[PDB]
Amino acid sequence: ARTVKLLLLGAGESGKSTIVKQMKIIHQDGYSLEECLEFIAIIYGNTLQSILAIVRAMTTLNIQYGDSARQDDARKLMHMADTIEEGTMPKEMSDIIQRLWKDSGIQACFDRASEYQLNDSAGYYLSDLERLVTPGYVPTEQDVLRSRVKTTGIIETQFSFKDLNFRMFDVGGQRSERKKWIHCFEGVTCIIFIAALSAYDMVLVEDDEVNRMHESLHLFNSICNHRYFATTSIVLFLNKKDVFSEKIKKAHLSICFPDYNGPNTYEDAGNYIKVQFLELNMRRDVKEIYSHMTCATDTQNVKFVFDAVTDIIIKENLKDCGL
Ligand SMILES: Nc1nc2c(ncn2[C@@H]2O[C@H](COP(=O)(O)OP(=O)(O)OP(O)(O)=S)[C@@H](O)[C@H]2O)c(=O)[nH]1
Ligand SMILES: [Mg+2]
User: 70, 148, 167, 212: which one is catalytic?
Assistant: 148
Task: Tell me how long the chain is.
Answer: 323
The dihedral region occupied by 200, where left means phi > 0, alpha psi between -120 and 50, and beta the remainder, is: alpha
CA dist 65 and 134 (Å) reads 27
Q: Max Cα separation, the chain?
A: 65
Sheet of strand 2-9: strand arrangement: 154-161, 164-171, 2-9, 190-196, 233-239, 290-294
Q: Decide: 123 in ligand 1 pocket, CB within 6 A.
A: no
Q: What's the chain's Rg over C-alpha atoms?
A: 21
Ligand nearest, relative to CA of residue 146: 1
Give distance in angstroms: CA of 147 to centre of ligand 2. Answer: 10
* Pairing status of strand 164-171 against strand 154-161: antiparallel
Q: How was this structure determined?
A: X-ray
Data resolution in angstroms: 2.2
- What are the counts of helices (DSSP H) followed by strands (DSSP E) for the chain? 13, 6
Domain ranges of the chain: 1-31+151-321, 32-150
Give residue 71's identity as a one-letter amino acid code. Q
Instruction: Give the residue from 242, 237, 235 showing the smallest Cα distance to 298.
Output: 242
The dihedral region occupied by 124, where left means phi > 0, alpha psi between -120 and 50, and beta the remainder, is: alpha
Backbone angles phi, psi at 193, to 5 degrees: -95, 130
Does residue 273 contact residue 201 with C-beta atoms inside 8 Å? no
Q: Specify the CATH architecture of the domain 1-31+151-321.
A: 3-Layer(aba) Sandwich (3.40)
Pocket test for ligand 1, best of 23, 47, 120 (most atoms within 8 A of CB): 120
Spatial neighbors of 124 by CB under 8 A, at least 6 apart, are 146
Q: Is 147 exposed, middle or buried (0-12, 13-18, 19+ CB in 10 A)?
A: buried
For residue 11, give the ligand 1 atom closest to its CA: 24
Note if 59 is an active site residue. no
CA dist 162 and 308 (Å) reads 11
Q: Decide: 155 in ligand 1 pocket, CB within 6 A.
A: no
Instruction: 251-254: list long-range contacts, CB under 8 Å, 24+ apart.
Output: 251/114, 251/200, 251/201, 253/200
Q: Which residues pair with 5 in a beta bridge?
A: 167
21 is in an annotated binding site: no
Instruction: 172-175: list long-range contacts, CB under 8 Å, 24+ apart.
Output: 172/12, 173/9, 173/10, 173/11, 173/12, 173/13, 173/14, 173/16, 173/219, 174/11, 174/12, 174/150, 174/205, 174/206, 175/12, 175/204, 175/206
Q: Is 292 exposed, middle or buried (0-12, 13-18, 19+ CB in 10 A)?
A: middle
Helices 33-60 & 91-101 angle (0-180, nearest 10): 50
Spatial neighbors of 206 by CB under 8 A, at least 6 apart, are 12, 174, 175, 176
Give distance in angstroms: CA of 44 to centre of ligand 2. Answer: 18
Buried b (16+ CB within 10 A) or exposed e, 174-193: bbebbeebeebbebbbbbbb
What are the DSSP calls for 150-213, one per residue? ---SEEEEEEEETTEEEEEEEE--SHHHHGGGGGG-TT-SEEEEEEEGGGGG-B-SS-TTSBHH
Query: For the domain 32-150, what is the CATH code?
Result: 1.10.400.10
